Amino acid sequence: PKPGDIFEVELAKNDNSLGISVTGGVNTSVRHGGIYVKAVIPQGAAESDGRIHKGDRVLAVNGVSLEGATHKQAVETLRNTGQVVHLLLEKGQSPT
């Protein structure tokens, strides 16, 4: 994919464990910045389904908007997902 394209991620729930975590980035000291990844959990989806690394930014989650205030609360939203989880991430601009 190109640097900017907003590719969507649609996979299936494995062992009721998405294998992905989030952190507080759009609620540190900005009106509306963005969220980041805490750590990749290659033990379910991030491993098999792949297409989930560290650094990318999560725009939304199963319809739930993260931009605004979703550091720990989002962790529950991702867990409370059916069999088909729809994630919308964006190719970060600094893979470090």
CATH number at residue 60: 2.30.42.10
Domain of 39?
8-90
CA angle 20, 96, 56 (to 5 degrees): 35
Fill in the amino acid letter for 78.
L
Q: How many domains does the chain have?
A: 1
CA neighbours within 13 Å on the CB side: how many for 56?
A: 23
The pair of structure tokens assigned to 47 is 């491993």
Per the domain annotation, does 75 fall within a domain? yes
Q: What is the DSSP letter of 3?
A: T
The pair of structure tokens assigned to 87 is 């994630």
Per the domain annotation, does 95 fall within a domain? no
CA-based diameter of the chain, in Å? 36
Per the entry, the structure determination technique was NMR
Coil, strand or helix at 75: helix
